[PDB]
Structure formats: C-alpha cells, structure tokens
Design a protein around this ligand. Structure first.
Ligand SMILES: *[C@@H]1O[C@H](CO)[C@@H](O)[C@H](O)[C@H]1NC(C)=O
Ligand SMILES: *[C@@H]1O[C@H](CO)[C@@H](O)[C@H](O)[C@H]1NC(C)=O
Ligand SMILES: NCCc1c[nH]c2ccc(O)cc12
Ligand SMILES: NCCc1c[nH]c2ccc(O)cc12
Ligand SMILES: NCCc1c[nH]c2ccc(O)cc12
Ligand SMILES: NCCc1c[nH]c2ccc(O)cc12
Ligand SMILES: NCCc1c[nH]c2ccc(O)cc12
Lengths: 391, 391, 391, 391, 391
C-alpha cells in the first residue's frame, strides 16, 4: 500500500531534464563551493618539470529543482542518487598533462533544500616551474588552479567553502616518511580574462613543499671527502719516483668519471645550475693545481743533464729554511786520467744530490701551503653550513 | 503455456528502480560483509614506495527488494543476474595510485531471501611506507583499507564475514617461488572521522611479508670477499718496487667504481640508510689505511739522500725482533783518492741496505697486524650472522 | 510483401531477455566447449616472472532459446548476430596481471538448433614460475587455466571440444624465427574447490617451450675464451720486469668489470643461480691463482738484500730438472782493498744471477702446470657439451 | 504555471534528430571557424622525431536549426547544452601518433541565431621533421594541420576566425622557464587533393620555436677545455721518463670514453650530423698528433745503442737555436787497458748526453708550435661565436 | 510545410534494424573493397621484432537497404550518417600486438544506390620477422593482412578496389627524412583455411623498406679506424722500454670495453649474427697478434742472464738484411784481477748489445709485415664496398 523512500526518488527524477543549468531565474549564477585536502605527494620529475600529487576533493552547490518537504516523506532530510542523473558543473584544472586515472563514485548526497555535494579522490600529474638553484635545500612553490572551462562569471561562481586559515594549516591526513613534506596550501580567488566581454573565475591553490636532503647530503659529501683524503695521503710519497704522476692522474680520472656519471643524475634538468656544480668545479681546480705542482716538482728533480744551481736561488732557499715549520810517468798519467774521471762522476753525483734536496724542500713547502688551503676551504664550508642552520 | 525460470527474472526486475539504497526503512543501514584472499605478490618498488598485489575479493549484502518464495517458482533458491541492473555499494580502497586494470564480471548471485554476493579479482598498486634499515632481512608491514567513500556510518556498515583467525592464517592459494612470502593478513575494523557529525567505517588489512635474501646475500658478499682476498694476496710483494702503489690504487679504483655503480641499485631509496653501507664504508676505510701503510713503507725505503738511522730506533727494532712470530808519492796519492771514493760508495750502499732491512721488518709487522684485524672483522661478522640465525 | 532474412532476426530477438542463463530447466547446467591455438610467443620477462603470448580462442555452447526451423525461413541454417544482444558466459583466465588489450568482434554465429559459437584473438601477459637453473638450455613449463569466475559446477561445465591429442600436436600456425619455440600444449580438466559446498570447473593448458641458445652461447663463450687466450699469451714474458703484475691486474680488472656488467643482465632474476655463474667463478679463481703465482715468482726474484740459497733447495731443483720437458806496501794495500771491493760486488752479482735462474725454472714449471690445468678444464667442458648433445 | 528557462531547452531538442548535417539547403556548406593558442611546450624527442604540445582550442559554426526569438523566452540570448545532443564536425589533426589524452567537457554555448561554440584543451604528441645541424642554436619549424577527415570541400569549409596577424603574435599565455620558447604561429589555408573529383580544406599552423643552449653550451665546453688544459700542463714534463706516454694514453682513453658515452646522448638522432661532432673530431686529432709527437720524441731519446749524430743535423739545430724564443810494462799495459775501457764508457755517456740535448731542443720547439696551434683554434672558435652573436 | 533533407534521413533509418548482414538474398555474399596508403614509418624494434606504421585506410561496400531515388528528395545523391547506426563488417588485421590507439570518426558517406564508404587513419604496431644479416644495408620485407575474423568466404569477399599497379607505386604522401624509406607495397589476395568446410578470404600487403646507413656507417667506422691508427702510431716506440706492453694492453682494454658496450646496442637482437661482428672479431684478432708480437720482442730483448746467439741465427739474420727495405808480482796480480773483471763486464755488455740489435731488426721486419697486412685488409674492405656500390 505504502512504498519505501523511493516514493520520493522518482518524484525528483520523473521530469528532471538534466543537461540544463538548474536555476529558476537565468540572471543569477550558480555558486560552487570547493575544498581540497592533500593526502600524499608522489614523485616529482625535475627533467620534465612535472609533479604527481594525490588529493581528496569535495564540492557542493544548489540545484533549486531537487527540493522537497521532509515531513511529507517519512522525515527524510538527505539521500544519495547517481551522479549521472543530475547536472554536474565542469570544474577542471589547468596546467594538466593528462586526463589522469581516478574512479567514478557514481553517487551524490542531496539535501531537502536543494544542496548537493560531491566527494572524490583525484591524482594530478601537473606541470609547474621547479627552481633547483639550491638543490638539496629546496623549497618548491607550485600551483594548481580550479576553474570552469566554458561557463563564464555570469554562470558559475567559485567559493572556498571552508575559511582560508583552516585550509592553509591542515595536516589531518598526509603520508610522511617520503622525500617531501608540505608547508602550506595557500588559496586565492582570481578573475581571469584574455579578451574583453568574456571573464571567468578561478581558485588557485599554491602548495609549498620542502625537501629533506640528509640522504642527498651524505651521498654528495662522502665521495668528495673520500677523494680529498686519498689525495692528501698520496701527496706524501717521494717525488723522484715515477709513480707519483701515475697516482695523481689515476685519481683525477676517477674524479672525472664520477663527476661525469653524476653530472646529470642528481641535477636532472636542462636550465638550472646549482651551486653544487660550482663546489665540484672548485674541487676539480684544486686537484688540477695539485697535479701541476706535482709535475713541476718532478720536472725540477731530474739527475741527467744538470747545471749547478745559481747562487741566489740557494741563498734564498737557505733563507726561507727559517720558516719550514826511469819511465814511471805513464803510470801516474793513467792514474791521473782515471782519477779525473772519478772526480767528474762525483761532481755529477753531488750536483744531482743538491738538486734533489732543493726539490724536496720546495715540495714540502708547497705541501704545507696546499694543506692550509684545504683547511681553509673545509672550514669555510662548515661555516656556511652553520650559517644556514642558524639563519 | 508456462515459460522458463525467466518468469521470475522480470518479476524482480520489472520496477526495481536501481540507483537507490534498497531498504524498507531509511533509519537502518545496509551491512556489507567482505573477504579478501591473497593470490600473488608482484614487484615492490622501493624508490617510489609502492607495491603491486593481486587478490581475490568477495562481498555480500542484503537487498530487501529481491525477495521471492522458492515454491512459487519451480524450487528456485538462487539465480545470477547482471550487476549493472542492481544497486552496488561504492566500496573503494585508499592509498591507491591508479584506478587499476581488472575485468568486469557482470554477474551476481541472488538468493531467495535478498542476499546478494559479488566475486571479483583485483590487482592493486598501492603506496605504503617501506623501511629497509635491515635491507636483506626485511619484514614489511603494509596496509590496505576498504571503506565507502561517500556513504557514512548511518548508511553502510562494514563486517568481516569470516572469522579473523581464519583470515589471518590463510595459505590456500599463494604463488610461491617469488622474491617475497607473506606471513599474515591481520584485519581490523575502525571508525574514521576528520570533522564532527560525519563519520565512516573502514576495514584495514595489514599484510606482513618477509624477503628471502640468499641471492642478495651472495651477490653482496662475493665481490667483497673477492677484493679482500686479492688485497691480501697482493700485500705480499716487495715494497721497494714501484708496482705496489700502482696495484693498490688500481684495486682501490675498482672498489670505488663497483661501490658507485652499486650505490643506488640495491638500496633504491632516498631516505633509508641500511647497515650494508656502513659495512662497505668500514671496508673502504680498511683499504684506505692499507694504502696509507703501503705509501709510508715505500717512503721509508728510498736509497738516495739517506742518513744513518738514529741508534735508539735500531735498538728498539732489534728489541721488537723477539716477537716477529824517488817520486812514488803521487801514485799512492791517486790510489788513496780512488780508495776513498770506493769507501764512500760502499758506505752509501751499506746505509741503503740498513734502511731497506728496517723497511722490510716494519712491513712484515704491519702486515701481521692487518691480517689480525681482517680476521677479527670476519669472525665478528660471522658471529653476528649466527646471532641472527639463532635469535 | 515478403521481407528479407531479417524476418527471423527479430523473431529470435523480440523478447529474448538477455542477462539470464538460457535453459528450459534450471537443474541442468550449460556446457561450454573451448579451444585454443597458439599464434606467436612474445617476450618473456625473467625479472618479473611474467610472459606474453598471443592465441586464437574459440568456444561454443547451446542457447536453447534461439531455435527455429530452416524450412520456414528460406532454407536458413545459420546467421550472425551481435554479441551484445545474447547471453555470454564469463570465462576468465587466472594468473593474469592485467585486463589486456584485444578487439571486440561484436558478432557470433548462431545455428538453427541453438548452437552458438564465438571466435576471438587474445593476448595474455600472465605470471608463471620460471626456472633458469640451466639458463641457455631452458625448457619452460608454464600454465594458463580457463574457468568461470562466479558460476559453479551446477551452472557451467567445461569441455575440450577437440580431442586432446589434436590439441597437443598443433603447429598449423606459429611464428617461428623467434627466441622460443613451443613443444606441446597439454590440456587437463580439473575441479577446483577452496571451501565446501562450492566447487568450480577449470581447464588448464600447460605450454612447454624450449629456448634456442646459439646466440647466448656465442655471446657467453667468446669473451671468456678471449680473456683466457690473452692471459695465456701474457704469461710468457720475463718475470723480473715490473710490467707483469700490471698486465695481470689490468686483465683481472677487465674480467671483473665485464662480469659485473653482465652479472644481472643475462641471469635477470632474484632467485635462480645458474651454473654459468659457477663456471665464471671457477675461471675467476683460476685467474686469481695465476696472479698469486706471478706475485710469488716476482717476490722470489729480487736482487737486493739476498742470501745464498740453502743447498738442499738447489740440490732438488737440479733434480726436478730431469723432467722440465822501500815503501811499496801501501800501493799493494790500496790495490788489495779495491780488489776486495770488486770481489764483493761480483759475489753479489753471482748470488743475484743464481736466484734469477731459480725463479726462471720455477716460473717455467708453474706455467706448464697452469697450461695442463687449462687443458683439463677446456676438455671437460667440451666433454660435458658432447654429453648434452648425445644425451 | 510558468516553468523555468527549460521551457525552451526541450523546444530546441524535442525533434532535433542529431547525426545529420544541419542545413536548410544541402547545396551550401557549413563553415567552421577555428582558433588555437599555445599554453606550454612539453618535451621534444629527437630520436623519434616527435614533440608534445598543449593548446587551448576553440571553434564555432552555425546550426540553422537551433534558432529562437529571445523575446519569447524571458530575454534569453544564449544557453549551454550537452555536446552529445547536437551535431559536431569531425575536425581532426594529421601527423598524429596517438588519440591522445584529454577531458570531454560535455557542454557548448548556443546563441539565439544558431551560432554554436566549442572550447577545449588538447595535448598533441605529433611527428614533425627535426633538423639539428646546428644543435645548440636550433630554430625548429614544425607544423600541425586541422582538417575534416571525411567531409569534402562541398560540406565543410575552414576559416581562421581571428585575423592572422593576431594569431601570429599571441603570447597571452605561455609557460616560460622551459627548454624552448616559441617565436610565432603562422596560419595558412590550403586545399588538399590526392585524386580528382575529391578535395578537402585544411588549415596548417606552423609553430616556430627556438632553444636556449646555455646549459648545453656549458656542459659541452667545460670538459673539453678541462682536457685541453690538463693536456697542456702534462706536456711539460721530462720526455726521457717513461710516465709521459702513460699519461698521454690515459688522457686519450679518458677523452675516448667521455666521447663515446656522450656520442649519442646529446645528438640523439640517426640522421643528423651536427658540427659539434666535427669540432670533437678536430680535438681528437689534435690529441692524436700530440701523442705522436710525444712518441717520436721518446723514440729519439734512447741512450742504448746510439751513434754520433750526423754533422748536418747538429749544424742546423745550432742554426734554429737563433729562434727558440825491469818488468814494469805489464803494469802500464793493464793501466792502459782499464783507461781505454773508461774512455769508451765516457764516449758512450757523451753521445747519450748529446742525443738527450737534441731531444730536449726538438721537444721545446714542438711544444711551442702546439701551443700556437691551440691558441689559433681557441681564438677562431671565440671569433665564430662572436660572429653568431652579432650576425 | 516541407522539411529539410532530413526527410530522407529518417526514411532510411526508421526501421533499418542494424546488426544483420544487409542482403536481399542470403546466398550471395557482401563484397568489401579496401585500399591502404602509407603515411609514415615510425620506429622499428629489432629486439621485439615489432614495427610501428601509420596508414590511411578506406573501404566501401553495398548495403542494398539504403536505396532511394534522388529526384524524390531534392536531387540528393549522397549524404553522411553516423557509423554506429549501420552495419559494419569486422575487418581486422592479424599479427597485431595490441588493439592500438586511433580516433573514431563516427560518419560515413552513403550514395543513392546503396554504396557506403568508410575512411579512417590507423596506426599499427605489428610483429614481423626482421633479418639483419647485413645490418647497415637492410631491406626488410614485412607483411600485414586484412581479413574478416568470423565471417567466412560465403559471407564476406575481399577486393582490392584500385588496380594493383597503382597501389604498388604510390608515393603521394610519405614522411621522408626518417630512418627508413619504403620501396613498394605489393598486394596479394589469398584464401585461408585451417580445417575443412571453413574457409576465409585475406588480402596481404607486403611492405618493402630500405634503411639509409650513412650515420650508422660513420658511427661504426670512425672508432675502428681511430684505434687502428693509434695502434699503428704506438707501434713505433723502443721495445726494451717497459711502456710498450702497458700501452698495448691499455689500447686492448679500450677496444674491449667499446666492443662490449656496443655488443648489443646496435645489433639489438637475440638471433641474428651480422657480419659487422665478424669484422670486429677479425680486428680484435689482429690486435691480439700485434700484442703477442710485442710480448715476444720484449722477451727476446732482456740484458740479464744472456748467452751468445747461436751462429746460424746471426748468419741468416745478416742474410735477410738484404731485404729490410823485488816483490812487484802482487801489484800486477791485483791489476790482472781487476782487468779480468772489466773484461767480463765488457763481454756481458757486448752480448746485451748484440741481442738488442737482433731484437730491433726482428721488430722492424714484423712491423713491416703488420703494416702490409693492415693495408691488405683496408683495401679489400674498400673493394667490397665498391662492389656493393656497383653491384
Ligand atoms: C616554416 O616552414 C613552412 C613550410 O615550408 C614555410 O612556409 C614557412 O615560411 C616556415 N617558417 C619560417 C619562419 O621559416
Ligand atoms: C616479400 O615476401 C613475400 C613472401 O614470400 C614474397 O612473396 C614477396 O615476393 C617478397 N617481396 C620482395 C620484394 O622480395
Ligand atoms: N572515506 C573518506 C571520506 C571523506 C572524509 N572527508 C573527506 C574529504 C574529502 C573527500 O574527498 C572524502 C572525504
Ligand atoms: N574461480 C574461482 C572462484 C572462487 C572461489 N573462491 C573465491 C573467493 C574469492 C573470489 O573472488 C573468487 C573465488
Ligand atoms: N581469420 C581467422 C579465422 C579462424 C580460423 N580458425 C580459427 C580458430 C580460432 C579463431 O579465433 C579464429 C579462427
Ligand atoms: N578557462 C579558460 C577559458 C578560456 C578563455 N579563452 C579561451 C580560449 C580557448 C579555450 O579553449 C579556452 C579559453
Ligand atoms: N583528410 C584526408 C582525406 C583523405 C583523402 N584521401 C584519403 C584516403 C584515405 C583516407 O583514410 C583518407 C583520405
């Protein structure tokens, strides 16, 4: 005799005639109130300048045709109806690279005063400009805007639903333990117009995210200090031996191949030039000047075809030493000849020994200077890190 | 005269009016009982913190409108009808990264008392937090939650169908011989609420999986012990020869390039720091101190420009040896000069020989110390492995 | 006056009422006869344990509602109707990783006795367990099962259509000139049941495929024999020269980097351990012991700081040689001193020469032993290959 | 009593009969006016000769059946109706590689005079010919054409809507800070015909884009000048030492491996041959001739088995030096023999010294020539860069 | 009073009853005439034996139910109707790996005599057998076949539309400046039958394409001749120096790593063995025998522990030289002893000098032989290239 609640379900859907903007008067617009909450931040692609995010989105508006009195229908205040049977605004998002992949959820709440609500999850892979000038300590500011693609300001009006301060500070759900953590989501309403007599409404959410670089800092600092330490420990071997230049060029080749294979992996971009490359270039130049010093010292010490050092050089190298911290005539003729030969050989040996001593002293002094330079570089780096840590 | 069973098929579907929650009274909610069984575990992505699983899922609920007496229709108790002609709850899964790919199966059983059942396979690629602190011996605890996205607690209520102990211990179907094997699937019912006056029901299944690391253990241990053995066998060659430093730096370069090309392949993450990296750093430091010892020994042995060793040094190096386990005057003038030259050369040779002996003794002692250190490291590693094996 | 054949097309489709299992009596089940033929085998993924295949599939069953007399309708025995207007069983395939990509073909033959047939191509990417213990000479046994996901044994019954011996030996269409060639497709009917009072029917096809490894065999054998030959030819150079150890360590580094870059490319898995790795480890160990022999020989030959060899050593090294295949007193005082110095130098030279001869003899003997070992290894490898070739 | 605006919504859609080209007379064609605006330029693939772009596209035409008087319906001039209920032309784009991914936007404006408009975003990945002859300073000219695939010139006519000069200079929306920046979008109308009696209309937009190569220029110039500088600094070490050839071959191997790993990454194509490869080949040849010079100098200086240099050679090498910037008889018999031996040794030493001096002079001269050549190459390169900068 | 042309649009579509093969008599089949034109050739995958092509395809057939007199309907001869409202044959393509991605174009021309035409673009990624025996100069012959999947020969008959000679030579549209250029498209009609009493019609188009290898030829020839030239220039340095073997092994390692990293990139297959690998193996063997010659020459020249060369060897090495292009007794006793020591040293020096001269002569002769062999190889290669160029 008396059917179930469905007695009203057809009563609203008998002659609804969807596909038309539901208003009693066409002059007034329909107002849509939206709300977004972040759930997780998926990977960000610096090469393609595109990021992937996942949000829970909700909206509501007024139908003005789905109105009924609760008392007439068993106290019924709200119900759920399929979303394909009612008018739905076309609220899209700009700077999108694909339609995306998301479920349908073909249901919507409808209240007794015409208010209709829509809840949905949605994943966006979207293009924003990424700046990686300070690559490890990045703070990215990307934007996503909601707007009606075709309806103008006289048709659809965008409202923020919740208060902006509630939206800005909302960490109710967020997947931590990832590469990124968000700082805030700042909303802003704007009016967009390319030409005259045609304007639209947009709502832009600016997402601010910060990277945690501890893994990146370790992976970028450990090989560098490793090669610096091995260069320092390999500096202290005799220079006249021919293995010094081989050791230095082998270490330089190792640094070169490491730098090349890490040249584009970490700064995966085609525009930005982070300061990490500048520090790497500085380290490379330090290795180059160390190799040049080693080559010069090796060239200075070479026993064959030598000349006695010019007095002034020895006189100031001893000065900077204050701051480092019968027919018997043929018989005697032959003996005189062999003696003179031995004196010549001894003189060559003494000249070689003096040149070797000069090379040793110069090598020690230049090693001390290089150690001081490395100390200065390391202390100024840790000083800048402390300045970052304490603003 | 009398049609087939389809005489009831239209009788239930003549004026069903799908799209409305089927209840006689709107106050009571509709209860959905669900059940999941794992079938296989596909790949897990540590870089993206996402895994892929395949389950068989079933659910059932009560329609309260598809009711009939069996006796009236040729003893018919249950039938199958297309799933697009009846109301279906929107039971979704959170922490999902895509809609996924699964067939439709447009059929459902319906019993004579209104009970309706739904069976379906489904593959989920979903985001959970992976911890790889102990990378080879991982035990991952990931979660997947079933909930109604839009209907509240007053509309849909979630029930576990089978008993929790049956669900927890269920290995009826599972594809073994993979990288992972599951331990348990723990179910838990919860009530979810972000704001007030709006609450939902969720059912969370915690999947616990364990990795079998034998392949990983072999692939990570074989090159390490290979390079340790080759370092040990290359340690025992004469130090005064110049090939020792070249051999050591070549082996160090090999270890460096292997470590760099395996630096991110196995610990494919940007947060976690497994202890395998710590052991690799320890091995690298051991190689570095071995190279430093070789360089020091090479520097100590250098025949040119030497001085006699200070007595105390020789006196304690012989002490630690207890624990290692007429005008004929011009003629004689020339002969005296050449004799003195030969004495000078012999003295230099003797000094070089003494320094070489000192270097040999020190090299042998330091080799013994290094061998003892390697023995200690290897035995403590196998000891820790045994402690893991026997708790 | 008299329409075309379509006069019967509506006669069967006027009140068909699809979506219901077409039977006059609900007690008897509907029987579906299926048939599959392979067309080509696409790539197989050993890392993901998944393969891709392409088959032509056909099935037929009885409708019992699409029945007519041919004589009444211009001799018409069979026709074609859209597949969306008739009942279609939900015959799915387990161990599938995706819904796949295949066309629709919205047409089916229907005969005058109710028999209805369905033809379709379908590509499956499906998960099976791959064993690569003998990686080049693989014979893979994978399975694919057809079953009704939701209908039970009382509803749908599976039949093989053609005889099993015809299905097993069917090479009518197959794309050869690929990486794999199939041996047989063995069908087997089974009854599946997880719980009680609920059983289903499945038809499992076991596909057996064999790999042709000639390209793999060449690519795996050529570099190995290349490095063996270059090691053999580099073995025969003087040992006292310092380039021998450099040559050996360079070749060892080359083998190491080749093995590492081919460590996971060919055995692309995380479980299996093929014997090719065992042979590679054996070759590596052979190279290691060759390097150790070279280092020992180099250490044995070192002219500086030598002692005369102990008699017994020389006495058995000559034994194993049988099987390799006035004031004139100051003047004479100075002359005696210089003569004694020359005797000392000559004695050191003779000791060095004797030690060099000992090192040469030992190096030749160990080279012969190493060559014999390489010969033994190569002959036993070709012997095992012949045993494989002739069972 | 009086319904809403929907009173006209059915009035236009009661018997619209979509699917037919809406014209009162079939002889006249329907005219579609289109407009495109670039929004961003995504990645370009030089290997596949395909690019990805994102545009906002709009079009309008005349329906001639959706006509009404505003006064009759509450002043209503325009409305919005679903796009699936009206006739829509099939305006496609050639040289497309996929259907693409874009939303639907199922709404269109309709004016009271039958004018209907359609707005949509669309992303195209499309194939055009890329020329990279001057790879860093590229100016690409690609094309995209809009045409009706099936309707001929007698049915659909294409019009540009806005004036061509407005379309050509339109930077209202464009995502800068990318790899590319566009110069202009030139439109052109054309008539297309493959066979006779069948012609179509097309509208081709030529997009002109320019690359900003600063990152590419830095990444391509820094390693090159690095290796040039290290070659120059390693040139200045003594030639008789055996480490010079090792240093040169190590640097050549480094250049070779860098060139090979960058051989196809930057010029990612299979047709074009940019001039950067020509400059790299020139640098390689310079390194090769430097290595050949080093080998020749090393061969010239070799102390063992020497002959006195032919006079003419010394006489012109001193010429080019002007531009570089009793029974006592046995006793004396033995003394004469040993003296003659010492003279022979001294003569060999003097010959070796003279050859070493010759080698040193030649090495210095060739080093000066090589430095001059490097200076010439660097100055002509910077000169060509300046010519590019100032046309 | 009199409606538009749509007066006939319903007249054909009032009771069309699609889904049935439109014929007045079921005995005669329906004939479909097809035509294909290539537009561009996308990438070809040699690893997966699959290619991607893009064609414009058209077909037409006879409906026999869409017939009208033009005079009755305002001279109307042809119109356009949606393709979903009429019967469409299921003409598919075999050897396809996916459904593909193509637009719909829901429109078809219909003429007044029942002739209906369909135009569509379509991209196929399809599997054909690729032979790369002569990898740079490939001429691939792949096939694509059009057939009705389910309708037999008694239902659908395939016709070529245009004449075969017109189809074979058709370059009206084709995107040049790619990796491939097509030679011809040969059509062929065939009858296909697996079993008896069941036959179908197929139309196979054989596409013939040729590769342009200039980029491949340059990229494969430049490093090879580079390493040959550097080997030749490094051959000419003194053999007794220890850097020769290091240079040779370094160059061999460079060739090895280049060959390995290019081992599978260019011949990206698992079956074919191109002749380029044979030439690379020949070059490797040439480098190996050069290294063996260098090692033998180095072994022959070793000053320590030498014996005088056997006369015959010197006598034929001078022969092949024709074709290369009182108590004073103790005093004299000591002098005699030292003189004898000096004679012994001089004899050893002379023996070493003679052995060095022998080694130099042999090295020069073998260098000449190696140069002649390289000349022969290069000339026969350019000769074979000329034979290819002039058939
Ligand atoms: C781009 O190419 C088209 C095709 O030839 C040409 O008409 C047009 O002038 C070109 N534009 C520029 C800026 O070179
Ligand atoms: C291509 O292959 C088919 C199949 O055998 C053959 O009939 C045809 O002649 C071939 N075409 C050419 C140009 O070789
Ligand atoms: N199942 C989660 C329901 C839910 C609660 N709050 C929400 C906010 C937005 C949204 O899309 C969904 C929700
Ligand atoms: N064909 C397997 C039917 C089946 C048996 N038990 C199940 C449990 C869940 C499910 O989705 C399906 C099933
Ligand atoms: N066009 C191929 C028709 C055909 C013949 N035999 C078949 C077997 C199975 C199938 O799906 C299709 C077929
Ligand atoms: N929401 C942006 C609406 C808009 C303004 N101008 C446009 C031009 C083209 C287009 O597709 C869209 C638009
Ligand atoms: N817009 C191109 C129309 C066109 C002309 N000739 C064709 C041939 C085939 C085809 O699919 C299409 C066409």
């Amino acid at each position: 005799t008396q059917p179930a609640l469905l007695r009203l379900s057809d009563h609203l859907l008998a002659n609804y005639k969807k596909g038309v903007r539901p208003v009693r008067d066409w002059r007034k617009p329909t107002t849509v109130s939206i709300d977004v909450i972040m759930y997780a931040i998926l990977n960000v692609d610096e090469k393609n300048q595109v990021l992937t995010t996942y949000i829970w989105y909700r909206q509501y508006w007024t139908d003005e045709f789905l109105q009924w009195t609760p008392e007439d229908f068993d106290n019924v205040t709200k119900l759920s109806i399929p979303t394909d049977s009612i008018w739905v605004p076309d609220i899209l998002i700009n700077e999108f690279v694909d339609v995306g992949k998301s479920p349908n959820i073909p249901y919507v709440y409808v209240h007794h005063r015409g208010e209709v609500q829509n809840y949905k999850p949605l994943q966006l892979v979207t293009a924003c400009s990424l700046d990686i000038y300070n690559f490890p300590f990045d703070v990215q500011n990307c934007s996503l805007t909601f707007t009606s693609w075709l309806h103008t300001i006289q048709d659809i009006n965008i409202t923020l639903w919740r208060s902006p301060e509630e939206v800005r500070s909302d960490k109710s759900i967020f997947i931590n333990q990832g590469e990124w953590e968000l700082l805030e989501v700042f909303p802003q309403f704007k009016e967009f117009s390319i030409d005259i007599s045609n304007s639209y409404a947009e709502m832009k959410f600016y997402v601010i995210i910060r990277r945690r670089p501890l893994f990146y800092a370790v992976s970028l600092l450990l090989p560098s200090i490793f090669l610096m330490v091995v260069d320092i420990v390999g500096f202290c071997l005799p220079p006249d031996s021919g293995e010094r230049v081989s050791f230095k060029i082998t270490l330089l080749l190792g640094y070169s191949v490491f730098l090349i294979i890490v040249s584009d992996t970490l700064p995966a971009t085609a525009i930005g030039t982070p300061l990490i490359g500048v520090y790497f270039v500085v380290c490379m130049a330090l290795l180059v000047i160390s190799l040049a010093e080693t080559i010069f010292i090796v060239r200075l010490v070479h026993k064959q075809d030598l000349q006695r050092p010019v007095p002034d050089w020895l006189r100031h190298l001893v000065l900077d030493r204050i701051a480092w911290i019968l027919a018997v005539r043929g018989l005697l003729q032959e003996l005189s000849s062999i003696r003179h030969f031995l004196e010549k050989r001894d003189e060559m040996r003494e000249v070689a020994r003096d040149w070797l001593r000069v090379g040793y002293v110069l090598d020690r002094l230049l090693f001390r200077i290089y150690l001081l330079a490395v100390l200065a570089y390391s202390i100024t780096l840790v000083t800048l890190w402390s300045i970052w840590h304490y603003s």
